Symmetry: D2
Subunit: 461 residues, 4 copies
């Protein structure tokens, strides 16, 4: 028996706000979830085409995963990373032996609790292995929020600072803010992508020049997102291979941050696998457990594992390897494999492409779309001017009025159809569902977006 009015009162009074001022905040309670739906206390069913934060890959509240979690709870309990469990060892084995079994670069795994912790771990490993201080990142990359992970995050809207309520006058970034260099993203220098007289993209060419300017001996790693998640982009095809090749030639590591693109999200097990290359280190979260319980991970190459194995590593994280979280990881990955959700993701993405083609034929406010599996971006433009409504685009901050932001207006309208859809960036949709989402829910969501776009293209906002 739940008093949801009291829940709302406690939520307003006792919880720190994010993205909303206390003044403007309206709690949105969710009582339960199932599949691709969120259920409100009043029983409203909301189709979630955010998939929360593109992180509930298996679907909400999967009975096999929950059954597995309950089973672990007959035995545990808690032990820290110094102790071995069946669940922890099995999860590592599934990742190296079963999912990555076709590639021979992967060596070992470290489990932590979050994607930010995974990136922190990867940054530490890369710097220790090379004995070099600098890490290269890209414009608009999001790699997490904790101190180290934030240093490689280049989105001024997502760096844990403060903005005003529909005002430009009360903004601040955190005082004090690094061993980090910002390179151009894949989406710079366009309008197609410019290459030199060698076919090398100008973003990569300049990335190479930056490393050489500092000296390769000063640079541990380039950390990337194969597709920018929060920053909401897709790369030209040759970018990922060219970065892999450039790093190899300069003797610098490449960390593929797969926290979002990992575990079937893009229609392969990992984002990088679309590109015929292999990373030195992968960071993991989100689909690692499909958010059933908090888990993150890093996978390091055999070379890197062999180096770390020769040393005593002075690093403790209390909940790293948590055996109940590991049981949840095991079950999540087993279901993913047995149901062949990767191939299902691939097929559903192809279906989504067709739906978006029709939406673009119909709606001139769709400037561009791209993606794969259950990860899509849709660039929104003024249908008249052919330019984005919000000039600062991906360099915006949240001090703007939401009623001026296209992705906000699309979200509010789509909501009238009982659909959750939109994006983090002001001019770009970021669309994701569970890997096992049904065609009918795809149709429902696309129809809702259709309805929102009519409204956007109508003015009246």
């Amino acid at each position: 028996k739940i008093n949801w009015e009291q829940v709302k009162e406690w939520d307003r009074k006792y919880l720190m706000r994010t993205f909303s001022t206390q003044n403007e905040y309206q709690p949105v309670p969710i009582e339960s979830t199932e599949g691709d739906y969120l259920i409100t206390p009043g029983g409203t069913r909301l189709l979630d085409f955010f998939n929360q934060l593109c992180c509930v890959n298996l679907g909400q509240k999967n009975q096999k995963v929950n059954a597995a979690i309950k089973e672990a709870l007959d035995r545990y309990g808690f032990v820290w990373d110094t102790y071995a469990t069946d669940y922890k060892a099995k999860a590592a084995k599934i990742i190296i032996e079963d999912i990555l079994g076709d590639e021979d670069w992967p060596g070992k795994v470290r489990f932590v609790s979050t994607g930010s912790e995974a990136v922190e771990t990867a940054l530490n490993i890369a710097r220790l292995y090379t004995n070099r201080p600098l890490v290269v990142t890209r414009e608009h990359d999001y790699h997490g929020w904790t101190g180290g992970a934030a240093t490689v995050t280049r989105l001024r809207s997502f760096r844990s600072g403060l903005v005003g309520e529909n005002s430009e006058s009360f903004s601040a970034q955190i005082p004090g803010s690094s061993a980090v260099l910002m390179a151009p993203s894949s989406n710079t220098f366009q309008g197609n992508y410019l290459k030199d007289e060698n076919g090398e993209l100008l973003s990569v060419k300049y990335t190479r020049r930056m490393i050489e300017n500092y000296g390769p001996e000063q640079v541990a790693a380039v950390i990337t997102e194969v597709s920018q998640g929060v920053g909401s982009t897709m790369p030209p095809y040759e970018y990922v291979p060219q970065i892999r090749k450039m790093t190899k030639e300069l003797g610098v590591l490449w960390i593929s941050d797969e926290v979002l693109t990992g575990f079937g999200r893009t229609g392969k097990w990992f984002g990088y696998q679309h590109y015929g290359v292999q990373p030195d280190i992968i960071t993991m979260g989100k689909g690692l457990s499909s958010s059933s319980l908090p888990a993150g991970a890093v996978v390091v190459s055999k070379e890197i594992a062999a180096f770390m194995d020769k040393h005593r590593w002075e690093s403790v994280s209390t909940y790293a390897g948590h055996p109940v979280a590991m049981a949840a990881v095991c079950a999540n990955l087993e279901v993913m494999m047995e149901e062949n959700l990767v191939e299902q993701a691939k097929n559903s993405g192809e279906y989504i492409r067709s739906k978006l083609e029709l939406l673009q034929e119909k709606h001139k406010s769709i400037g561009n779309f791209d993606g794969y599996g259950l990860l899509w971006i849709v660039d929104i433009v003024n249908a008249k001017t052919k330019t984005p409504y919000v000039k600062l685009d991906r360099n915006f901050r949240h001090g703007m009025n939401p009623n001026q932001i296209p992705t906000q207006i699309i979200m509010e309208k789509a909501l009238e159809k009982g659909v959750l859809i939109g994006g983090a960036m002001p001019n770009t949709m970021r669309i994701g569902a569970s890997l096992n989402v049904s065609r009918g829910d795809i149709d429902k969501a696309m129809d809702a977006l259709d309805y929102a776009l009519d409204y956007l293209e109508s003015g009246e906002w």
Copy 2:
């Protein structure tokens, strides 16, 4: 039907080592746990007087906590922090209204997933609230391992660097290591009484004051402390904690009490700071927050700090922050703590442990000093002849040393013969803890095993 030989094989092969080289590593599989016990696949029962990392406050595998997690799983699922749930709101209400209800400084709570995430959050909030860059920490403090939390960690043995196997030749800290000042710990400037100036002030505090004055108070956001150093294994002189509270107030600087370890009954109060009649501006939480049932951390901020943050849109997202199933575990953990009155149980067992340690010190000249409260104890170990620590670098040691040279390692190995896990992180100092509800029989059994280990240490046969 679990093949534990194959589990050990996968564990060696596929998991990154910490503290042990692959060469020297032997997996120690634990098949299940209960109360104060770990159970091996063979069925051996191990009395855990580390309480893992002093973080299973309620006891292992509490039936009511586990039943509550099972219930949550009927409904969830996962929503991120933008969505409200009963479990998340209730957990915040329990902390603010029930546990801290008698104090009026607390305003609001932010939940995250780990103690390190909680410290990161507190550092961000302190700097934003004050609009100032610098944070003061102390020598030997441990506040976590992630970037920002690590900058305020002043233990060179726990900064996620590398050392060799029984060698000084393969030592490295992470390249690139800044907005932090290290002040003396409370355990500095002695006779063996703590030195004070002509007013009340401890020299550790007076110098901390001079340090902040040297940079300028307008540059300094906060002092972050542990009321009792956890990994660093110390206890303060009584006046330290009130004197730091008063100093920070006088300078217009915040105080963050990092209660990740000392929180939720560990010290025989709800919070460590509560022994000292003061209140902080911000508290960081983990460990006993959920008693390790599921991953959770949190920050509590004062009413003034909440009011300021409330006026702004805060551009911070953590995917698993507020995870509804973790919040369910937190609610159940806290309600069992309250209803069983585990805080009082911890206070009483602490008084009991004190008397057991007095008897052990009488028996053992290798016990130089011991101190603590509730289920958090330090025991400083000395060479019984020379009366000096065996390991000279003490709390400034690193793990390159041979464990056969380390008193707390020797003690741990020997105690293990009695089926008891007990020892410490520091080379010369035990860090002892159990569940808040640890029985007297288990205390006696742990203390007997320590007695036994100390005979061996003192025999010099090692």
Copy 3:
């Protein structure tokens, strides 16, 4: 009587080496100088077409400057900046009223002892005035060697680190070597590509970087109008485009005129070729023509009015040194009265015509550009049409000088009694006094012709 053999022994034994190891070092004593010549103890006259470090603008040992220094020494002595002198006030007046009299942005001057100190001062003022921490520099910029000036220096061959003797094995940068961002130099992205909103890709990306961090985080962009040590010339539109972009984003522009200032480029300052005005200028070299150590910063009226409202807690013992100020006064008065700016402009036109003839004759000249008495000549392999030294401006000094084209050219030209070459391996940096005679220009150019014949013969390989 000077025992020059004893001087060499003392020089070997007691002075720290730079650029040469003790093992390879051979002292090069200079007994006196005059005009464009250096005179050895033996009486050999060497024509100096490096003009030392493009810093003896007025010419060596000007009789009027030396006579003015001698007069000042009848009165001083030394007073620090708190005390006023005629020489310090007059040097400030000459700069603001006389030299920059035709421009209305200049406000006040601060005198220091060197160009690095001038840059440190400008960085301090920029960050204080804007209350912002970040400063933007460019790839291959040189702005000095002291801590702050070094942070904006982006040449890995000039950051006060160490390299081996003809070896790659003993190289290090200073440990620790920071509120600075590196943008592309003007010589990136080529013939230069444009946004066709008109914007050079170098400027476009610089803009993006500032927007990505947030313009409210960025105090200034510091540039060289022509990269000195780094040895380049910009596309014509670059300097006006950077001025326009910084103004639009509310960011300061510091023109580092330590090298290009005081007639070097055939105008009083390099920026004056481009119809723009900076917010802050930094000065050294031609400020006194190296007669005595002096540097300076000039800040705009707005900046001066802000600084004037505060008590500035900055002391430099020798800043404003009355005798160095007497030297600056005499140096600037001679420059003005002899019309050396116009003379430099006319000699540069002459040099251009000499270089066109050498390029027509020497396929190892891939390219040249410059103005006044500041010229770059890019050298290439006449056969492949590409540079001999692949790392180019990202090299370090560990390589063998017998592999370096500008070292080859220098050794060869010395056989003609001419000092000429460059800091960069593939690029000449040529400078003489503003009053260098046509005869001496012909003599240097003839030595260069001779040197390129040798380079093109490939005998040194």
Copy 4:
């Protein structure tokens, strides 16, 4: 014929202010100098017992130095460091072979143009030699104003920030302002009687804590400790044992010691260098000020034989345009030769002893003199309220310049002493920093001390 009014107008309008707002600023012109005197345009003679910034060691406008500068100007001109000259090589030989000839440790010299550049150079060298990033400094150290030298300066009143005019309102430090650790001053940890606290083996607690600090970060992270043997701008003298205890601590930890001798060097303390009072030898010395007695801008670093041998094995990729400037080097040579031939080190030592006697007599007469100490021509005098025995300005060495000068005892003293045509005072609010030329006459010491006596009569009346 100089128009001094026009000079003062150009000065007001076209020069950036330091320490004074434009609103409050009044130019103080000096037409010429001689010995220990500054001469105003009107012909007022001011006895300068600041010796500018304790940096005109030989005296103002020395005839032999000026003649040597004029001789150099018959030949030069300018050559950068890549070229050898007689003046540069001779200056290095004088330092290593003549001045420091009785010590075995010194190897080589690098000349630069300022003390801040010398400190920048020492920090670079210590970090390169050890291959470690951290340098340790102390509370209230002043090591210069440029980016690297500023990181090891721990006086918030001298870090090139901004404060308001007679207000706490409008203050700022430079945005963005680390591979530096701050250790306690030698002047920390005193008991009630003002005695320095030590452990039972006599080790000062300031040193004991410094060692703990280094051990906490790890000695393998720490390149160097940089010190001032006597804090200059920060205006202190150390407990006697501090300097040897730091030398011994650094040696035991494998860490370098940089003695920043920019102020204490070249006879200032009645020895060639401040460290020489203490029976120790540093790894690196930084020099400025008395190096040329400010005749022209010059700075230098001296490195040990072992550091020089390491540096000699590499190509060092570092250029400073004016480093080694031959005319500046000719001034250094003449400055050092005069110092040696006149035996100015001994003169300074004996004059310090005379000064001590005058200060003892002043302290009997004036209860506002809480303490004094020093040596040679470098003295501190701590000023207290004669009635409370407590400093007037509570923040003391951690003050900033936003304070009203009419509340600052060292400002009140300077203003009063000026009535007697003596310049005397200090940078810190409760502490005089007194210096004159090494060859200052007894009569001038008497004149300065009589002005101080006068000023303290006024301070002690409380009328201000």
